[model samples]
Structure formats: C-alpha cells, structure tokens
Target: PVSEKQLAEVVANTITPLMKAQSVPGMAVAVIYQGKPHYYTFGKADIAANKPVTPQTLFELGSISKTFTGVLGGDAIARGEISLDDAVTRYWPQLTGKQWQGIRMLDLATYTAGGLPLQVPDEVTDNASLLRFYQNWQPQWKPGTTRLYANASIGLFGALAVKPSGMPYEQAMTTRVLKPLKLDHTWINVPKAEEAHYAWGYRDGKAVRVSPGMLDAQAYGVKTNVQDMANWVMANMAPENVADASLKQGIALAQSRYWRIGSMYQGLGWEMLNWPVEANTVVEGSDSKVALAPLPVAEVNPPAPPVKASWVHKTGSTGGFGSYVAFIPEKQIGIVMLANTSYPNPARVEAAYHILEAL
Candidate 1:
C-alpha cells in the first residue's frame, strides 16, 4: 500500500468528480490492503434530510448476494452435505426427468444450464408457480452446451443447498452460513427498525428497495454495510476458520475457479480473470455485437495464454442501487464500491479497474 497521504489524495480526487457527474446520492468505498480495511464515505445517505453516508449506513447488495448464495452452496458441498454433480431432482423431486434432462447442479451455478431465463418469469408470482413453471418448460439446449447468464439458475441452486441438511433454505443459510461467519449488520431482510439505516436509493425520480421476487430471499435480498463488506472481502484474501472449519472451507471453495467460459472463469459466484487484464474484456462497449441469443457449444478453447494469476470480481444492483466488489489475490489489495442509484453505470466498473491498476 502507498502512504496514507498519497492513497487518500489520489483516490479522492479521482472519485469525487465522477460521483458528482453521475448524480450518485451516496457511495461507500473501501480499500482493503494486506487484509486490513481503510474506508471512505461520500455524498448523502438520504437526500431529503441530507444525511451523510457512513460506515453504519446500509445499501442493497443486488446480485452480488449471489456470491453469498453460491459460497454457501459450495460450503455445503465441502462438508459432504451436497455434491455439485447431483441432479436437480435429488433435492426437488418435482423436477425429475421432466424438462431438465441430465442437468447437474453445477451447471446452474456456472450459468450453463440450458433454457434458464435471465430472471424468474413473471408468470411465477409465488413459490408454487415457480415450481410449476420449471416443471413444464423444456431445456432449450442440452446442459453444458450453452452459457447464458440466468438468475433462475443460481436461485434454484440456493434452494438445493438445503433439504439435504434437513432444513429449509433460509434456516440452513443463517444457521450454517451467516451465523458462523459472524457478518456485521448483514441481513437478508431489513427489519422495520433497521430500515432507517438503509440508504433509500433512487430510480427515475422514485425511491426504491429490492423488489420481493419468486426465488423468495435467494435472489437479490441482502442489505449490507460498508464494514461488513470489507469483512467479507478480507475472508477471501486471508481465510481462517475461527468458528467452524467447514464455513472457512466454504469461503475458500467460493473463490475457486472451477469452470471457465472463454474470457471468464466461473468462481462460486465471483467471476475470475487473469490480470493485468486487457481493456477489451473490461472496457465499456467493446462487445457492441455480443449475441444475446443462445449459442450452444461455441468452441471452448481456441488459443490463449494460460492464466498465471487471477483477479476475482462480482457486480450487483436493484431498482436504485449499483455495486461492485473486486480483489487481486497477488497484489493483496481490493476495492468495494456501493452507490444508491439504479444502473449498470460502466463508470463504476471502469473506476474500480483503474484504481486497482493504479495501485
């Protein structure tokens, strides 16, 4: 890490104008150096009362919570409680050989499960419908033949993480995952009292929080504070099992690059890349023509240099929040940025990459 003076000046000067230009109401930015945390707060937590963003203030994690969900699933696998190769029918017998022909649970975690949609379909407003929807649909392509990012995929894997534990998904997650890890003010649902701590985010002139969805709590349901996020990142860099060895193992398993998809390697929920990365991969608009349609069995490896090291990252959002978390294991430095805005602000990602490169 650079001296405190240089680090603060360089980062603040670079980020301040970007926040102002983008109309971000609040942001919680932190730099984790050598497994320790240095936090920075900027802008308003609430626009009406003009509250300042603070370490105690919370923001929605969005899809970044998928990392949490995936890690817990991996944790279960490490403990011999579940197997990645298990068929979806093992947990929910309802899915037995109906539409998911030989779909392994791991395929869902890696987003290679054919026919899964980007989000749970609107036709599935509740749990019963969610199951029926999956029961009737046919796999568009054979599993492992295609890779399309799908929320329904991981959301179901989250459900499969339990039942084997003899508990439902929510209870097993808290009892086995969150409680042992000892996160700070981290929660799947914000209580009425804790809602005051939440930074009300904005979208199109309206205030919003994460909308409740069919995956129930498995989708984007987490609200986290800055320090809690720092604590979570520190675990990735330096994992230690104080409470339970299995949970620590779960975190380590979460960071593993078990699957590769061309430019990206699939971690538990985080995406992996070997750096110093090329700009085409992270830049804003390089893939202007990226086909949204399914491409089953696009050749796996043409030719590329072998990965000598890795940088892992994940991004998230809700109707009114944008977030990014990234870390380089080799450099031992990471940055976590959160803002109250509804967006895929390429600036958020670009700024994170620039600062990591600068360090």
Candidate 2:
C-alpha cells in the first residue's frame, strides 16, 4: 500500500526543485493518491507582491478547457439532446457552406476532423471572421480518416455542443457543469470577486495573460485554483460518489474512449495512452500528424477496460502557463501539475509520472 506521508515527502522535495530547474515563476500541484488529496505550492503567485502560491491562486488551464467542453457535450448526450454520430451541420446549419456531411459530432470531439490548422490566421480576430473561416472551409477527407490537432475542431464542437440545449455556451456549461460539479472557483471569464487570488502568468519578464479569440476561448479558457482542480481530479477519479445525475453522466461520457490511433486513445476530452510513457514517446505525439488520435471504436469498442494500469492524460498550455493532468482508475490516483511557463515539453507529465511511480 502507498503511504500518504511518504508520498507527501517525495513530492515536497521533488516538485520544489523541479520549479527551479524548469524556471517557472510559480506553480501549484494537486495530487489524489490512495483516496486522499494533497497539495504543494511553490514560489510566487505574484512575484511583484511577494505573494506565495496558495490553494486559492487561480491559473489558466489552456487546452485543458477543451476537456470541460467535452463534458458539456457529454451532458447533452446523456440528456438525449444529441448523438455523437450526428453531423456538424445537423446542429449548426449556418455552416452548410462547407463540407459538413461527413464531419460527425465524434470527429470534432476526437481531433480527427478532415484537417484543421491549430488556430485561424492571426488576421481572423473576431467572431465574424471565425465563423466565416468555418463557413468557407472544406474538409480534405472524410471526418474520421485523419487526426490533426486543431483548436478550430473543438472550438466549433464547443459551439455546437450548446445548440441542442438551446442555451448559450457559457450558460450551458455554468448551469449543467460548473454548478453541478461544484467547482466554485473555476471560470472561463475570471470574475472580479476572484481577482484577489488571480495569479498572473508570465512570459519572458512581463506578466501577461493569453486571451483566446472568441471561439478559441472555448478551446482554452479555464482559470481555476488548485483546490478546485483537486475537486475535478476527485470527480474524474471517484465520480461514483457524486449524487447529481447530470454531473455523473457528464463525467463518465466525457471520458468515453471514442477512437484510438495506434497507441493513443481519445476520449470525449481526455486522452488515455498506454502507461509508463517516455519523454521521447510523448514528444513524438505533439509532432505527428495523428497528434492525438484514438483507435476507432470498431477496434477497441469497450475502451481497453478502465483499470488501474491504464494511463489517461491531458496537457494544455498558453503563452504563459503549462498544465498537465493524469489519473489512474484502479488506483484512484490523480495528479495535476500547473506551471507558469510555455509548452512543447513533457516536463509536466514527466514530473508527475516520477512522483507517482516513486510513491
């Protein structure tokens, strides 16, 4: 059996030094191991104020926000509001100008929709431009044939995820997800009341926050405290304890493995890879065409069995912060590492992996 005190000691030493090595201005880590949650805060939340990182410091989640969008979709799926196989045009008829016939709802949830550039051109800064980009674009292949890591894929999916419920994206998420999940401190907009603890992310020497374009926000706009994130870890790791039906359904459906591309497994928002991943292997994923594809349902219909050994993870980053979350079902172990730094590195997962293994 794993000892909580031993694990805490391991983390205190390891993650503290890790920050100095990685050069992150501040970071907060939350871990749930053996049915208990422990957190470690290091460095500063605001270097100028000499403010130390705390359980309440809020950090942007970047693409990890994409995971919540999947829960929004899953909530819809559970309510019988939409089908994963439904075509994109079925919900957003405004996009009939493009090739939507083959783009199923699942294609957007999984990153396997024809092909999408990571972001729209820097010139497409507003809502009209984002919509026009989607309105005029055409898919190069059938939806499920390829997987390209693109913000536009889920940005559009997040848009349609709200259509069946006939509510705004933010409203649909707030009422059905944020409230039910009881993530009191999580926000896409970061309310002024929570600003007291809002940790400013740094880029180079200046502290700046990334503002995702209108649709890009849906792809990466979550800002939350470590305490709330621990709750999210709890929700993912031990969701059966949640009494709310919508939240329970949302969690389970969002994590359903929809497709697999080689070793990568895709869920509504999460990605489950074969465990004990190496730095080299994880980097190769970000550089490949099928950057994050899962095996098609026909191949592994039931999703490799959600057992203790299965490793599921999701990584997100903005210009100022990098975040990684991973959990094991059988062990009920979850690790969340958030740093004020850039992405394109496996350091987050690498750090979490070593701690879990050593513990």
Candidate 3:
C-alpha cells in the first residue's frame, strides 16, 4: 500500500525533471490510485505575471478532447439516437451520392474512415467550405482498410452525432456527456467568470492558445483543470458509479476496441494496450509518425469488449498546450497530466508511465 506522501514524492520526482527538460512554465497532474484521488501542481501559469499553477488553473486538452467526442457519440448510440452502423450520409443527406456513403459512424470515431486528413484544408474556413471539402473528398483506401488518425473524420462525426437532438455540437456535448458526468469545470468555451482560472500555454517562449478553426470544438477545444479531469478519469475507470444508465453504457462503449493497428487497439477515441505495457512501447505508440501516416488496420470483427485489465490512454496537444491521460483498470490506477507547453509525446508518456510504475 502506498501512502499519499509517497505518491506525492513519486509525482514530484517524475514531473520536476520533465518540466525542466521541456521548458514548461506550468503543469498539473492528477492520479487515481487504490480508488483515491491525488493532485499535484508545478511551476507558473503565466511567467510574465508570475502566477503559479494552482488547482483552479485551466489547461486546454487538445486531441484528448477527441475521447470526449467519442463518448458523446457513444452516448448518442446508447440513447438510440444514432447507430454506429449508420452511414455518414444519413445525417448529412447532402452527401447522399458522394464517397461518404461508404463510411460508417464507427469508422469515423475509430479513425478508420478511408483516409481523412489530420485537419481540414486551409480553404475550409466556414461551414459552407467545410461541406464542399467533404463533397470533393476521395478515399485513399477503402473504409476499414486503414487507420489514419485524423481530426477531419471525427470532427465531422461529432457534428453529425448531434443531429438527432437538434442541438449544436457544444450543447450536445454538454448535455449528454459533461453535465451527466458532473464535469462542472470542463468546457468547450471557458465562460468569463472562469476566465481568470484559464492557463496560458507557451510555445517558443510566447504565450499561445488553440486557434479557432472549423469544427475545432469537436476535434480539440476542451479546457479543464486537473481536479475536473481526475473526475473524468474516475468516470472512465468506474463507469458503473455513474447514475445514468446511458451515460454509463457510453463510457463502456467508448472503451471498446473497434480496430487493431499492430499491437495497439483503437477504441472510439482512446487507444488500448494490454497490461504490463512499457514506457518504450507507449512512446512508440504515441509517435507522430504513427498518427500522421496511414497504417494498415484489421477490423475487430464483432468488436472487442472492454477489459478490466489494460492500459487505456490518449495524448493531446495544440501549438502550446500538451496533455496526457492513462488508466489501468486492473490496478485501479490512472494518471492525468496537463502542461502549458507543447512538449514531446514520448516524454509525456514516459513521465506518466514512470509515475504509474512507482505506484
């Protein structure tokens, strides 16, 4: 049994060097071990103002927000508002005869939708151009044949997932996922009252935050604090504790494996690895080449159900902020780290992995 003091020591030892090595101005980390939550903060939220990182400091989640979008889709499916087998054209009838007909809701969430780019083209500045981009898109490979981790595919999927509710994407996300889970501090747009708590990210010694782009919210626009994120980790680790049946099922479904790429299993938005995973393995999986390159994929026929003993995690980053979350259900241990700088994914993975190992 590890004491809270021991846990704090391990965290400090793991994080301190990482911040110095990466030149991160601020960072917050949350851990769930032995069914209890532990929190830690390091450095300043803003160097110029000399504001130190605190419990309330909010950090952008970047692509880790994609996992939330995946859960939103799963929640919609649980409510019978949509189906994974549903064709993409069902929601956007405008693409009835286009290449989109070959894509399924599941394909998009799993990043196996032919080959969508990581981001929408620069010309796709608005909804009208966004539609045109999809209309003219051509699949590089058949659906389910390749796993191309992309924002364009999942962003479109999130947009369509809300159609049944007749509400906007942000509203649907708040109503279906955030509200039900009681993630009070998490938001797609941080309200004015909470603005003071928001952390400014650093990129090349300049303060930066994610820029506005079409479907940015759906892809990577979540701002939250480690305290709220610890709850989110708990929600995923213990879905049964959630009161709403649909929300609980959505949590479970988001963790289900839909495709296999090498040793990694691709779930709705998170990636799963069998237990006893090493830092090097996690580093390889989190590599940029793996994310940007189109990799061969094998559909997990009938899909693989959630395992109580596995490493489920995701890494996200904007130009400035960087975030990483990982949980091991078998051990009832989870880690969430957010930094106000875009650091190397390998470092983040290794740093978190070291903490997990110490525990």
Candidate 4:
C-alpha cells in the first residue's frame, strides 16, 4: 500500500505527466483518502492570462449533477416527505398515463421506467413541452424491465422532491444538501459574481462560447470545484455510518442496486462498473465487449473483472466539460477530476484509473 507521501509523489509524477501529454488546458484533481482531501492541479486555467489551475477554480459537473439530485431525493425521504416507492403522479398529479401512473419514483432514479428515452426527442423543445411529452408518453417497455439512462427522467425526480418541499430544484438543492455539507462553491446555477472564476468549456481543441443552457439547474447545470467534490466524496463514503445519520441512511438506500443490465449495476441515479483490467484474454473468446471498453481486449466472452484494485465510478459530460468521480470503498479512497473540455474522451478516465492503480 502506498503511504500518503508516496501517493502524493505518484500523483505528481504519474498523473501530472498524463495530463500534460494530452495537452489538457487545465484540470483539477482531488483525492479523498482516509477521510481527508488531498488536492492538486495541473496546466493553465487561462492560457492567455497565464492563470494557473487551482483547487478553487470552478468547472461544470455535467452528469454528476444527477448525483446531487439523488442526494436531494434522499434528503426528502429522510424528512418523511416522500418515499422512493412513491408514484410520480403523487407529487405532480398531472403526470397521468397508462404507463407513468404505475411507475414509482424509484423507477425514475434507477433509469428503469422503460419508455423514457435517453432524452426527449427533438420535438420536446422546452420544460413545458417536456411535461406534456411525459403526460402523453407511453412505456415502450414496462417499468423495471430495462435500464435506459435518461437525464430528463432524473431531473423530474428532482423536481418532484422539490415540489413537496415547496422550493425549486436549485434552491432545494442549496438548502438541503449543499449548505449542510458546506459545499460553498457548488451550485446548480452559477452566480453572476463568480462568473469570472468559471472555466470556459472547450471543444475541438479550442474554447466554446455560449450562454448556459435551459436545463442548467435541473439536470446538468451544476458548477463546482474539485475541492468541493472531495467533500461530496467524503459524504458519500461515510453515508451509512456518519454524523448525518438521516442522510446516511437515505444515501445508503439510494446506492442499493435497484436493477442490473448484464454485468453493470444500476442504483438510484448511479452506475457501477465491475471493470477488469487483466482479462483481455477473455475477450479473445467472446463476440462483443463492454460498451465503453477503455482497454484493448482480444474478444468478448465473460467480461474481464475490472483491473486489480477495482473501483466504482460515475462520469458526467456535457457540451463543453467532462467530469469524473470514482471511489474504492475498501481502500477508503476517492478521486474527483474535472476538465475544461466537453469532447474530452474516455481516454482521460482510463489514464486516471491507471494512475490510481499506480498509487
């Protein structure tokens, strides 16, 4: 096992070099080991101004924001205002249909409410349209029959939680989760004053300029720094046995595997990967491999167990930013990496995993 000093050195040497090799404009990494956050930065925050990346520089959290919505749901359950099994129609009685009426809130969280597409098709232009679409959308598959990852579905779950709380998703998130955890720099909506500190999301090897999108607060609008994410990792790691006992229990329930898609584990708004690093040989004997196989393999049969010293992770990507948060419960370690590139490839995640293995 690597000592703290050894780990720090490994991070400085292995991880830093990998970032530079990719010419990543800037990156902020935070590791939580034994309940303490060990943070580091690499590259430039603003190349023209020569500003360096720091633990405090904010970056878009992308899909990781769903986890925040999950936390809000857990908090709502803890307060006795809702239950995971509660029907979606209970909060928004307008959500009535042959399929949706029977679907539970848990279905939305686990991505198991079958007809909900990965996202609403192009026809549904705005939130109003989205709501109408849901009202009329029928299930292509029954609830809990399959997993089809959907952000709008998860966002609806968040909206339901907030409806009962009599607050909007953004405000409910801030009061119930962010404030309690002291995650000051994290927000579903970035404030104007702090706009200067925000990293411009990049694409195609250059920065992309645009206003924040409409779903900013509900689904993927979260903006946070690596330092703040470390705190989130700490809270998740100790969820079941921490001082925030209500939150702990609620989170534990949320993380429970609600369904499975082949070898992948699906919990409330979380995906678990049992990745195998050494089983490239198994692929030699099979037809197809994992959907996003980071490592090269010969064939695809019984999927390889994840590389040794395995970890479970969740990744978030949007138009301009990519984010990764992973943890090894057994090792009591977690890593949070935020990059300023939207089209950033899974290669960065694989490289980070290799670095973690080295530590």
Best by TM-score: 3
Off by over 4 Å in 1: 240-243, 284-308
- Per-residue CA lDDT of model 2 for 111-152, tens digit only, reads 778777677677788777877888787766666776677788
User: What tens digits encode model 3's per-residue C-alpha lDDT throughout 1-97?
Assistant: 8888889899998899888888989999999998888889999998888888998899999999998998988888999999999988888888754
Candidate 1 per-residue lDDT over residues 34-61, each given as its tens digit: 6568899999988887888999899998
What are the clash counts of all predictions, listed in order? 1, 6, 0, 12
Between candidates 2 and 4, the TM-score winner:
2
Worst 10 residues of 2 by lDDT: 290-299
Give the Cα RMSD of candidate 1.
Answer: 3.2
TM-score of each: 0.91, 0.91, 0.98, 0.84
Measured by lDDT, the strongest candidate is: 3
Residue by residue across 37-105, what tens digits does model 4's lDDT show?
Answer: 888887777766677788888888877888787777877888889987788888888766767767888
- Global Cα lDDT for candidate 4: 0.68
Compared with the true structure, all predictions reach lDDT values of 0.77, 0.77, 0.89, 0.68
> Over all chains combined, what TM-score does candidate 1 have?
0.91
Stretches of candidate 2 above 4 Å error? 275-308
| Runs in model 3 lying further than 4 Å from the true structure | none
TM-score of 2: 0.91
